[PDB]
Amino acid sequence: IDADDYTVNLTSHTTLANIPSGAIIAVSESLTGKSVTSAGWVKADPTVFPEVTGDTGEAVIVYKHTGTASTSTLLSYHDSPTYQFVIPNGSDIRVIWPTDGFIRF
Amino acid sequence: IDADDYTVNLTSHTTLANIPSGAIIAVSESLTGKSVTSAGWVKADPTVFPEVTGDTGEAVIVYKHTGTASTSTLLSYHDSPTYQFVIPNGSDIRVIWPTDGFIRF
Amino acid sequence: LNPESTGHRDWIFRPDPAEDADEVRDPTLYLT
């Protein structure tokens, strides 16, 4: 996700249809190793976006893929104080999750 | 619930069978009328405990009900000190929620 | 010495984890 094309609002947005459709530098392939713990943490294996070209990108968003963009519910937004951006250049991009889980329920 | 039996843990107590059989001062029927706001606050209309005898438990618990102690699971615990001042008269005792919600998902 | 080393390298992006407070409110009992 490109953060100049998407000022995040954790309250008003609900579905993929709310994300300004040009902010999407790349689309996640489906998650794997999806697992849970008694603390309510979700975990998954790292995700690759292959051969990405586009503008500078600054955030990752997770949502329930359901084919129709109007019913695909958003479930998180992520950035970091130090992993602030990526410059796509034809390389792969790898999102490596924190090993102990990345969303709390 | 009677706190003199249930030492307050929800970090490893997880099913109804973990709540001591001696702790249930009162139990009440399924919550009549429920909704969840766009803000994720769960809401329900008031509930009553019938003909209650016994006293001085000082806490309240809510759980998903299956009819069986192994698969019914805990959703919240509450501890407001006004629970120190019910001393049941062999009486109806009534549970009034905050108007706007009591749990956020 | 190593042809494959002269290709692109993957960007590693590391999100901070998402969590929020256990926000909750207590029901009030009444005698009747």
Name the 3-class secondary structure at A84: coil
Q: How far is A93 from chain B (nearest CA, A)?
A: 32
| Cα end-to-end span (Å), chain B | 24
Measure Cα distances from A33 to A20, A42, A50, B99 in Å.
30, 10, 19, 41
Q: Does B34 touch chain C (CB under 8 A)?
A: no
Of C1, B10, B27, nearest to A38 (Cα)? B10
According to the entry, how was the structure determined? cryo-EM
Strands (E) located in chain C = 11-13, 28-31
Apex CA A36: angle with CA A32 and CA A41, to 5°?
110
CB contact, 8 Å: A11 with chain C? no
Spatial distance between the Cα atoms of A76 and C18, rounded to a whole number of angstroms: 7
Computed on alpha carbons and rounded to an integer, the radius of gyration of chain A in Å comes to: 14
Residue B57 burial class via C-beta count within 10 angstroms: exposed 0-12, middle 13-18, buried 19 and up: buried
What single-letter amino acid sits at B75?
Answer: L
Task: Tell me, in Å, the resolution of the deposited structure.
Answer: 2.8
- A16-25 long-range contacts, Cβ below 8 Å, gap at least 24? A16/A63, A16/A69, A16/A70, A16/A72, A16/A74, A17/A69, A17/A70, A17/A72, A18/A74, A19/A61, A25/A1, A25/A52, A25/A54, A25/A55, A25/A57, A25/A88
E-assigned strand segments in B5-97: 34-36, 41-44, 47-52, 60-64, 73-78, 91-96
Q: Which tokens sit at B71? A: 């698969």
Amino acid at A59: A
Looking at the partner chain, which of B92, B95, B104 has a beta carbon nearest the beta carbon of C27? B95
How many residue pairs from chains A and B have C-beta atoms closer than 8 A? 4
Cβ partners under 8 Å of residue C7, min gap 6: none
DSSP-derived 3-state class of residue A69: helix
